[PDB]
Design an enzyme around this catalytic site. Sequence first.
Site, short mmCIF file in Angstrom:
data_model
loop_
_atom_site.label_atom_id
_atom_site.label_comp_id
_atom_site.label_asym_id
_atom_site.label_seq_id
_atom_site.Cartn_x
_atom_site.Cartn_y
_atom_site.Cartn_z
CG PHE A 28 -0.97 2.35 35.48
CD1 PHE A 28 -1.18 3.16 34.37
CD2 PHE A 28 0.28 1.77 35.66
CE1 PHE A 28 -0.12 3.43 33.46
CE2 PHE A 28 1.32 2.03 34.76
CZ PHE A 28 1.13 2.84 33.67
CG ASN B 117 -0.38 1.18 28.61
OD1 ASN B 117 0.61 0.59 28.17
ND2 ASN B 117 -0.33 1.96 29.67
N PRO B 118 -1.18 -2.54 28.18
CG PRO B 118 -0.33 -4.47 27.11
CD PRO B 118 -0.56 -2.98 26.92
#
Length: 266
Positions: free
Chosen positions: A89, A186-187
Amino acid sequence: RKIWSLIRDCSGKLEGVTETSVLEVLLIVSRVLGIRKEDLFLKDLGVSPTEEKRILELVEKRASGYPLHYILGEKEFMGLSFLVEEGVFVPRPETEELVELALELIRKYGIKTVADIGTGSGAIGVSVAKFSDAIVFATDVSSKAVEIARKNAERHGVSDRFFVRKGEFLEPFKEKFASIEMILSNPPYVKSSAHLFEPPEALFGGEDGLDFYREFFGRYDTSGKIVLMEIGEDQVEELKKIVSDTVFLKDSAGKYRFLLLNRRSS
Ligand SMILES: C[S@@+](CC[C@H](N)C(=O)[O-])C[C@H]1O[C@@H](n2cnc3c(N)ncnc32)[C@H](O)[C@@H]1O
């Protein structure tokens, strides 16, 4: 051949993808030529046949939608150069605000031990590690993540203080849970029906977007710790039903973006 002519032709090809198309091309060109953004200044030329084709490929690549930063193999976060590639990500700028909140929380309470769940590129854990004396324990279900985080840490001289292991939540660090003063994440907070060039595990938390949070607060006792995690705009009221005592912060946009559970005691 003509370098700046090329750059214009390509800008146009990215108008439906990005508002800043020219900058993207400058970046792509710089990368392909293996040069710094800032050297792109000669007022004339500087590109060879095979180089030209490569740039066209990558502009095509990007044209479809493929994230710019996979192509560059790089991303600035906190003014630090983070590696990224497919399967990891790519850091968003909002997460900087989280790292800056975390850093003041450290200074305030003189925190020495911090965790980062779902480290990704390593972007939160390495930053905290780079800009404080804290040591950071980081996890990620993805092996690419962990290789990449280890490289990014090493790439910023914090390998001595940023440790990363594959697993979910803090299962690979049950041994250190006691000592962890602050848990950062930061899931994935996006609904299953808010529908990828990036990993699905990284985005979504079930039809609710809350799958992570429910597990986290169910599984882990946060007494004595501080929790601070990024969240989706809409989930404030529902999150208040998962955890009570929680605080929620607005961001630069003035939209709720972080939950804050301070269970640190005096
Ligand atoms: C939204 S991305 C954020 C990456 C990084 N924290 C950032 O903000 O730049 C979520 C990351 O969490 C990982 N992940 C998702 N659920 C996890 C879990 N339960 N435990 C550990 N990692 C998880 C994924 O591998 C992915 O890289």
